[PDB]
Amino acid sequence: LPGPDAEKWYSIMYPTRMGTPNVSKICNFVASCVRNRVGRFDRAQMMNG
């Protein structure tokens, strides 16, 4: 997503992308979820280019 400062939105925008080091509550939540539900999963490509 565009903007002047965009390298910190991804941690906010994808919770399941984070690694899981600890038994902190965030890391107990994140590692107890489904992995293949991140990013794109459907598009409609009607023309080349």
CB of 16 to its own copies, least distance (A): 11
Nearer to its own copies, 1 or 44 (CB): 44
Nearer to its own copies, 12 or 32 (CB): 32
Q: Please state, in angstroms and rounded to a whole number, the distance separating the CA atoms of residues 24 and 28.
A: 6
- Check if the beta carbon of residue 5 is closer than 8 Å to that of residue 12: no
Supply 13's token pair: 């925008």
Q: Which residues bind its own copies (CB under 8 A)?
A: 19-23, 27-28, 31-32, 35, 43-49
Q: Please state, in angstroms and rounded to a whole number, the distance separating the CA atoms of residues 33 and 36.
A: 10
CB of 31 to its own copies, least distance (A): 4
